[PDB]
Design an enzyme around this catalytic site. Structure first.
Site, PDB file in Angstrom:
ATOM      1  CD  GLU A 293      43.336   0.033  65.191  1.00 49.70           C
ATOM      2  OE1 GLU A 293      42.994  -0.449  66.298  1.00 49.70           O
ATOM      3  OE2 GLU A 293      44.170   0.958  65.072  1.00 49.70           O
TER       4      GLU A 293
ATOM      5  CD  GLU B 190      47.714   2.954  62.149  1.00 51.30           C
ATOM      6  OE1 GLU B 190      46.713   3.038  61.397  1.00 51.30           O
ATOM      7  OE2 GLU B 190      47.724   3.324  63.347  1.00 51.30           O
TER       8      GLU B 190
END
Lengths: 461, 461
Positions: free
Chosen positions: B165, B365
């Site tokens: 990210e 995730e």
């Protein structure tokens, strides 16, 4: 008058634990330990420590079996003799040496070796440490023992078997007290039946990953004895239905068709005693059926309704659905306690042909055990065992009708070649074509041995 | 009854900085420096220096993850531990040895390595000397670091990621004050987001020139939560359209499509805040898309018009075009302040399938954080974290129906395997399948860990 297909194999069957004796063996199997601690549970306290002396006298014993017409000999390799460390399947050098000696000696006597990997002889240490066949880790250790056998002896052994009668291990160790540890626990027994089917499929898979020649093949040896209902009473028919699923399909269907019998799974589930299986395990069972079947057949199985309702408050057992039945007028092997019914041979043959793809199969055991055979000796110490010859004729006649109907039967193996140690009954009943005088380990052909040699020469009688 | 594709990977996700501890690490990352100078900014004064003791305990930690059903483990190599001098990416010998120990230990425990190169851990010296991700020289030094990882560990790692990210780095370092240096400057954030996309693409090019096996592949880990508009009024629809482009397309499009979203650059251009890009740089971005996609999802994203006109006199920020919105009746994780909306996973699946060539991707995730989990300890010290199992059950059900419609999802990674250090939140909330008593570094499987292992066995639930 009664003839057999070209190439039909005439053989004999024994096992390592009942012949070798325990000479210099590294580990105790469950029977070895049972005898070491409760010798009184064995006929006359005769246990397996000497047995029929095959460890010391294999060469001459094989020569006598060849004399008796044994073209193929089926015996077993003991996990407890071959393996040093069970976790890694490291090798006991003296035990490897011994099995190469007997296989080489079979070949030199022109006997085809048929090698079974397991015959009731779990190492006691694996029971003490993991509860034996209840342990899916013990299953893995078995496959690693199998792998070593294939790598060590696969160069001159074409015909293999994973197990002799896993159902007798289940019954004996977990249901009725026949085998040490003498656990009496139905649900455990269900898991053990599952675990042993899984071990067999995992061994088949490793066998074909390792095989080199096309004629190498691996099978399993089962009782396929049919369950005859006592009457057409619905309650007796339903007892026979379940007895059939549980005593035959439990192993026959996963070994040959790849899956467990649908109606049995449903009954086990409803009773809350189903095995623990995973999809990965079931896929292994589905993908690795045996190449061939060994059928052990001795007596029929007759069954009536249970005395009490199966919904009675009692520990779960497969026996809550059926009780054994005695048919009036049955033919009996009395000093032994078994019914004699040759026609079941024909039913088994037809069942394999119609329902199991007519997979290649053999009669892997058929025999009659008789007590006090010294009474039938003649002037040269030759047992006049005409009863055994007539017993063989009656069952071979039944077999040949199944073959003429088209069943793919390829061989007939008598239990047994030489009188061998029959577990807690020791040498009370004799089965061999060859008598063993166990005080001196001197062996002599019976009358049946010469008949058997002649049967193989004419491929009939 | 809810099943997954064959080959599906059940995994867990963490990072180097949040697990290792700073034991014998040569360099400070921005969080290390931040805790060393302002420990009052971290929950209960708990910082990165011990974290979950992975530096000292990795082998037993991996063994615990293997019994929790972790099939693949995703973690990260720290720039600040592997590298001696950043300008040449010369090697710190102890750091190299540490990561070979970790990777070797994973394979020994039958856990597939998934190695990410960067997780919010910029070396603080590089911020002080070049202002970090604002500098295209720093971009080059990251590529030299990545090249070293591939050469050292490419022999036994197949699955790689460039960044976890980058958006959180842009947001945290340059927009909202979540990450040291806590710069608040929209235009710089825009340049940093360009530079990190460029750094990822250059790293992908370097990876494939160095690859040896066809199985080797490298992706990027993004959050792709859709921007749900509060209502159908055009002002709300406008806000959500920009929020979507800004928080998702800004990274998804260059990573997978090889170009930037045109309606986004148009608005950055009109607002005078566009990044500085060269045609050669844009060529590198277009020529090296990722091989796969890692998707992080935790909660939905809802958005309404801004309270004032974007034309108002004010510093440029992405937020001038949108405001977050709270939907009445939302399902809430009321202790953590997060809405639960598993349907977003189904929307993500469909978007990847329909608009991004159904590139191979995984849920890299997904997880639920809960504070004060000692409240649910049994009498044996096992967290009864049924809430976590239900969370997974709801999202996996949504995930599966995206797979049913054709989305090429190949895995699901739980955040997290072992409770780990969540930046300024530290250990206030726990995400793991495995509890860590942080005072003693003693780790215990939670109930959900047993529920994760069996899920892997059924490949379903």
């Amino acid at each position: 008058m009664v003839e057999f297909p070209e190439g039909f194999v005439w053989g004999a069957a024994t096992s390592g634990p009942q012949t070798e004796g325990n000479f210099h063996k590294q580990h105790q199997n469950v029977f070895d330990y049972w005898f070491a601690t409760e010798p009184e549970q064995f006929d006359a306290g005769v246990g397996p420590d000497t047995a029929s002396n095959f460890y010391n006298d294999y060469d001459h014993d094989l020569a006598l079996m060849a004399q008796a017409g044994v073209q193929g000999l089926r015996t077993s390799i003991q996990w407890t003799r071959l393996i040093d460390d069970f976790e890694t399947a490291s090798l006991n050098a003296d035990g490897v040496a011994f099995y190469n000696h007997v296989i080489d000696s079979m070949l030199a006597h022109h006997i085809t070796p048929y090698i079974n990997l397991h015959h009731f002889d779990l190492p006691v240490a694996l029971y003490d440490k993991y509860h034996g066949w209840e342990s899916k880790h013990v299953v893995e250790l078995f496959v690693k023992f199998a792998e070593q056998c294939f790598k060590l002896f696969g160069d001159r052994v074409d015909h293999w078997y994973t197990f002799n009668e896993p159902k007798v291990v289940v019954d004996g160790q977990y249901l009725y007290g026949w085998h040490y540890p003498q656990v009496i626990n139905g649900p455990k027994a269900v898991q053990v039946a599952y675990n042993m089917n899984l071990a067999s499929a995992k061994t088949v898979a490793r066998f074909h990953e390792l095989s080199v020649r096309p004629e190498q093949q691996i099978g399993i040896i089962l009782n396929l004895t049919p369950a005859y209902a006592a009457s057409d009473d619905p309650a007796d028919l339903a007892a026979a239905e379940f007895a059939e699923l549980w005593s035959n399909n439990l192993f026959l269907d996963p070994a040959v068709l790849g899956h467990f019998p649908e109606k049995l799974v449903e009954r086990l589930t409803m009773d809350g005693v189903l095995w623990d299986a995973t999809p990965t395990e079931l896929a292994i069972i589905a993908a690795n059926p045996v190449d061939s079947l060994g059928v052990n057949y001795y007596h029929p199985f007759r069954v009536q309704r249970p005395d009490i309702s199966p919904k009675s408050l009692q520990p779960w057992m497969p026996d809550i659905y059926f009780k054994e039945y005695d048919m009036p007028g049955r033919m009996m092997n009395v000093d032994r306690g078994w019914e004699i019914y040759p026609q079941a041979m024909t039913d088994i043959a037809r069942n394999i042909q119609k329902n199991y793809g007519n997979i290649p199969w053999m009669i892997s055991e058929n025999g009659m055990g008789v007590a006090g055979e010294e009474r039938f000796l003649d002037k040269q110490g030759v047992v006049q065992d005409d009863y055994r010859i007539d017993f063989m004729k009656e069952h071979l006649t039944a077999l040949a009708k199944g073959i003429a109907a088209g069943s793919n039967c390829q061989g007939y193996f008598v239990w047994s070649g030489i009188d061998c140690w029959s577990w807690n009954h020791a040498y009370h009943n004799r089965y061999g074509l060859i008598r063993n005088d166990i005080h001196t380990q001197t062996k002599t052909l019976k009358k049946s041995a010469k008949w058997f040699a002649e049967l193989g020469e004419r491929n009939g009688f």
